[PDB]
Amino acid sequence: MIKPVGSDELRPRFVYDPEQHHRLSSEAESLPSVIVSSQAAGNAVMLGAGYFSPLDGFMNLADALSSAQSMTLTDGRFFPVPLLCLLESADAIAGATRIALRDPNVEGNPVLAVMDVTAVEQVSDAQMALMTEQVYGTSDPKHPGVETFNSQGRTAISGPIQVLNFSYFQTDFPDTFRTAVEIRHEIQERGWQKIVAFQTRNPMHRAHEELCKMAMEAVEADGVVIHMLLGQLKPGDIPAPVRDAAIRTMAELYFPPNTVMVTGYGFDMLYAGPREAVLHAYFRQNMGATHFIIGRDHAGVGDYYGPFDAQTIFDDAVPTDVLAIEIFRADNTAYSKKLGRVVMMRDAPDHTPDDFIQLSGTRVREMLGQGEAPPPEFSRPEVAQILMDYYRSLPQ
Template identity: 40%
Template structure:
């Protein structure tokens, strides 16, 4: 198919980036190659140094338009999401791109002011900010755009449907399920992707933030003279996860724009779905010595300088808001809230370059980053891989759901979290022995990969379920298991809230398929593992022990019923409890 340009325009906060992200996900699902040119990202890179005078704004738009023309000329879809306030410069871009679709995101200023978490509209209306588009700097609304989305009245899904309908009508994109003809470079790219057969990383590119060779030596030398930010156990883990690409598309710790939108809407500033803030908190004293536009060294707990951050933002977060939105509570009894409230009052953001691992791997034989797991899956010829997140031993219920999921997939990745957890969680080394024993005796080895997930546990329930799914997408998983009370703690979340939260995103946006399972148990009626969907009876016919009951049995050295736990797993847990008592 021939390339084309989709040009989103509208005031700040009108929904351009959100709709662009949704549209790009949908078009990629239809085998259309898409490149998104986000206004903020362009200003950070292509138009760095330009201001906000009319001349600078026009120069910025011309640069975006030129890159968009090149992308479209190569046969792809170029998608822009920039305010582009002036009609003449937009018309200039239209004249240079014969297949040009203008999408106007219309929204009244009072609504935008209410949406604006940073209060910029209110400050502009009060005269505290000058030359603000739509307030004291003009925005010239399009006269004849191909599509108008009224984002104050229409849902994101309704807006997306209008844009898709126009693109289909123009013949620029295939209808859902239609065959796609490609040629030249597009065909080569499609063939390469098909040969690999793996899901794309979140955002389309697997991030790698390791510094190597001469760059590493130069950076290490420069770091000696930089102000220092001390990392804790969680941020050490975050540095590693960013470096290996597990948190793609993040290239560092979030800036305030990404942070605020993630907290409020579960999206990055560019509209891409993302559910958890990845932030770096510092003390008041440390913040005073940090200047936006400069660099700082990141120091691990053992005193080593392990990374350098390019400081692009510094701000004071509303932690009460973050706690309520992310954890659904402000109670410090919640371990996630307790951690949040115990960190410094100032956040700093910016891209990082990593010199060395903050912490040595506790299980090197099972330590595989996303690039390695992807290579493994490709070598095995697996295309449908289901990921299973766990921070507990695998008992019969979890064995059942992983094997059920495996029936519709090529392979299973058991991906235990081995970063920071609560003090009363079972230690990672004990759990790893349980996984090894279970896989050796009860799984088909050629269909299972045991690999560690070195992230910290946040106990954010539903939001963390999305976070875990997106990370496993980066590792190459096409499917992800979401069970009962995923990533939960206490009674802060409903039993199946972690499954329902995925409905907040339209199909295709996340790019990974969730497999939802109800509570599993051994049914005495059917004589096998089952759920309430597949086995008749009531609680009296279900072998389903509470965690407290299982701990009591293990502490007494008694094996739980074999219908609940494999005896090999139970014996490892009994031995571990004896040693720790």
């Protein structure tokens, strides 16, 4: 198995021993407590689930400044983004060395983690601006990741945490949410030696299906982990049950036996483009993937990043040999009339534009909503049917 990043074994922060879990849960009900931001809560779930191994909790300001500017902690460990717990005020936990962190995204704000607080620090305007410009590559308040980061308050609490649950990501998505620990176990047992990871939050049509297959053939992979971003439903997104049925139907009918793992994780998007792509590679190595697909404008928003910056950041900016996972560099696909299959256009230089047929993800979605199956070059009939049945069911 590919090694975890920075250690020989994953070091998750979830309390796996049930007796210790029960004792901590009991203790937490009498501790001073704070409700954290959704960003900090996601950071805690990722730490609990082993995705951010081998880190122990939330960063002090020196580690956060070092991570933002250089992708390292002060002690030299590689980690690509700051992991901060920022609050409007630390008054409720003044002088406390042990506190409960409560979940902002579950009714009644239950305890998510217990934290040993080793520092409480105020972040200056200059420190915030430095971290913002370095992580997000802009100072524009129109950038949604910039706005969230700067909307949490300026008191940073730092120290190691013990995670008691995985929030609504597990409760709402019980069949798909997986820890990095369990994805690594499952890769191991299924016998896969090379494994491609692919992120999505919506149904996969033929273009994305074929991109996974191209990547698998190129690197001689034994399997693909489809790693779905779980979270609250965004306007125009496909509800989870329908999305899951579409992905699982594609996997069962169009891939060979024992080649697909359908899984998911919970973490708020940063919209940080090339910097977020490094974070993605980091946690995918932790879960056991050997290859990670990065296409055009990966993790991007607006016009802040160049189309392939998230690929090239791995050439220069990421320190040599900190990561063992390799990038499969994807690009736009089209159906080749000459070859009778979906290809990356860049890899068919013998073709003229007229040799391709193109149909966007937007156009596919429009057709499905009108009850018209897209051409079989772009959508599988059984996947199309699942989506058409969904759109037809709506009162709209």
